[PDB]
């Protein structure tokens, strides 16, 4: 074995040549805050939330993309790491709309959770926020693009798993918009799974929309019957009524996806 030795908070861990910093922190039971890293999509490195300090190195590295080198002490809870996380969370919450009550993702939002955990507690943005035109990409996905933090999980899912190649980023800068650029209806057989991976409430589930709220839902781990693949799902109900169907992780069936018929 050619496993190399790195250090997470001084704790020694043996990783593979080519292991990123994020998996190196995962092997000691630590989770780095991330928005654009998804373990089944390609590494984008375009939200800068996973910034973590390597000691004796005067620059935070992107833990989703950076492979570890032999002997790094990965300082996860250091001072400049937390300043990096709070600054990047502040920039993500600059132009983000105050939609948390009217948003379906409230309570199941990554941005709320790791803003509470890793960001600051107040604001400095005394300016006017952007407002992005809402897209029509189907009867399954309600699209509210003011909430999009431009993390490009749409594009990586539609290009690498759904194999559609029809989502993208038009524009440039703070006017850059994730969409289709035309009145095109995103209809694949996996066109609802973009509702799962969107860490914000930009892509919500249009049949599920406005009905329920994830803290009062009861999770029931069940099996799909729509196809003979046997997709592990969660039937999440609320007071004796089936609200929606989430996926379950299973590395040998449906890795963490389901079809649109199932969903």
């Amino acid at each position: 074995s050619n496993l190399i030795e790195v250090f997470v908070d001084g704790q020694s861990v043996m990783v593979e040549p080519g292991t990123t910093v994020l998996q190196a922190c995962e092997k000691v039971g630590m989770q780095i805050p991330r928005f654009c890293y998804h373990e089944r999509l390609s590494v984008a490195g375009n939200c800068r939330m996973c910034l973590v300090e390597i000691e004796k190195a005067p620059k935070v590295v992107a833990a989703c993309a950076m492979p570890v080198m032999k002997g790094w002490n990965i300082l996860t809870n250091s001072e400049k790491t937390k300043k990096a996380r709070e600054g990047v969370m502040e920039f993500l919450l600059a132009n983000h709309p105050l939609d948390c009550p009217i948003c379906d993702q409230g309570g199941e939002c990554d941005l709320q959770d790791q803003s509470m955990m890793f960001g600051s507690d107040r604001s400095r943005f005394l300016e006017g926020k952007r407002a992005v035109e809402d897209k029509n990409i189907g009867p399954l996905v309600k699209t509210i693009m003011t909430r999009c933090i431009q993390c490009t999980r749409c594009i990586r899912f539609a290009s690498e798993i759904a194999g559609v190649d029809d989502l993208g980023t038009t524009g440039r800068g703070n006017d850059m918009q994730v969409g289709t650029y035309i009145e095109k209806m995103f209809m694949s057989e996996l066109s609802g799974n973009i509702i799962d991976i969107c860490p914000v409430g930009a892509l919500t589930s249009k049949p599920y929309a406005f009905t329920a709220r994830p803290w009062e839902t009861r999770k029931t781990e069940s099996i799909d019957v729509m196809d003979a693949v046997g997709s592990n799902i969660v039937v999440s109900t609320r007071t004796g009524e089936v609200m929606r169907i989430l996926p379950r992780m299973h590395e040998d069936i449906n890795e963490e996806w389901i079809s649109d018929k199932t969903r």
């Binding site: 431009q150 703070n174 850059m176």
Partner: peptide, 20 residues
Amino acid sequence: KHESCGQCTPCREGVDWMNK
């Protein structure tokens, strides 16, 4: 801010915010 490709967070948000 007119010449910035909008890829990652701090430039895309903070350069418009520094221009404001």
